[PDB]
């Protein structure tokens, strides 16, 4: 439980930088832009996670379906094992059934 | 997001402040202090 004996350097973070000032600018691109583009394609991230949300099993299945042929050998084997374990746990285990 | 408890010193001290006058290892060891403070209360 030994806590540190010196005060840390206080992080002087500014609330008015470029990212915090321009955060969420075009979230209403469809609403105020005569609907041409959805807020889906503003999402910067993975190929399989753009405009999609699910639990861990559906996430792993979607990853194996989109970028499954581009994953690594060990990552593909680990994802197959995770898919099998999540399938077994989600179907054959639980309380509420 | 890894979260850890930082005030654990104060967590053990809120128990150990009621057990300073005990005999044995109950005034120092936290495992033995909690059972001694509970029976005392």
């Amino acid at each position: 439980f030994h806590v540190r004996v010196t005060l840390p350097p206080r992080k002087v973070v500014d609330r008015w930088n470029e990212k915090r000032a321009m955060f969420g600018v075009y979230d209403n691109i469809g609403i105020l832009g005569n609907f041409e583009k959805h807020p889906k394609e503003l999402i910067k991230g993975p190929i399989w996670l753009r405009g999609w949300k699910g639990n861990e099993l559906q996430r792993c299945i979607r990853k194996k379906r989109m970028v499954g042929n581009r994953m690594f050998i060990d990552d593909l084997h680990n994802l197959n094992k995770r898919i099998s374990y999540l399938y077994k746990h989600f179907n054959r285990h639980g309380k509420y059934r | 997001l890894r979260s850890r408890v930082t005030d654990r010193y104060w967590r053990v001290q809120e128990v150990l402040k009621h057990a300073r006058h005990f005999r044995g290892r109950k005034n120092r060891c936290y495992r033995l202090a909690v059972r001694a403070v509970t029976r005392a209360f």
């Binding site: 806590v3 540190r4 004996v5 840390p8 | 850890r4 930082t6 005030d7």
Partner: peptide, 26 residues
């Protein structure tokens, strides 16, 4: 290393208490 300012400030208060207990002020 643990991220936090509250633990550091709360230990500084205890350090001030220990210093006042060790060397009493005039």
């Amino acid at each position: 290393a643990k991220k936090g300012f509250r633990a550091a400030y709360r230990f500084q208060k205890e350090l001030e208490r220990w210093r006042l207990l060790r060397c009493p002020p005039p």
